[PDB]
Amino acid sequence: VITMDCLREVGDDLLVNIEVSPASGKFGIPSYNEWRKRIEVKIHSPPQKGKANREIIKEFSETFGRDVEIVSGQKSRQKTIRIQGMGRDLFLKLVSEKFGLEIP
Numbered sequence: 460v461i462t463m464d465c466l467r468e469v470g471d472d473l474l475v476n477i478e479v480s481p482a483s484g485k486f487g488i489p490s491y492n493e494w495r496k497r498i499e500v501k502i503h504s505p506p507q508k509g510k511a512n513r514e515i516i517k518e519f520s521e522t523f524g525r526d527v528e529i530v531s532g533q534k535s536r537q538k539t540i541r542i543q544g545m546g547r548d549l550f551l552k553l554v555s556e557k558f559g560l561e562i563p
Contacts, residue, residue, distance in 0.1 A: 478499070485557050
């Protein structure tokens with residue numbers, strides 16, 4: 460289930476560890492784990508082809524309406540999505556709102 464951390468609260472921005480992908484129909488972005496160091500997000504087929512990078516800010520930003528940026532290392536697909544103007548509760552809120560899941 461969803462009960463792990465991954466989102467980092469940094470100023471008016473928030474950092475999350477996931478793959479290069481925003482979230483298709485209904486913000487679909489569960490919690491991430493260090494073990495996997497990779498989270499599974501939901502998006503279109505064009506995004507999961509790489510566009511997910513540019514689509515992230517497109518969908519991600521649209522999904523919630525905030526700023527997003529693929530951090531970490533996209534080179535290996537596994538990177539960190541940095542959200543600007545957002546926080547932890549925010550990301551979680553959407554997850555709890557959309558994903559209906561909360562991270563304690």
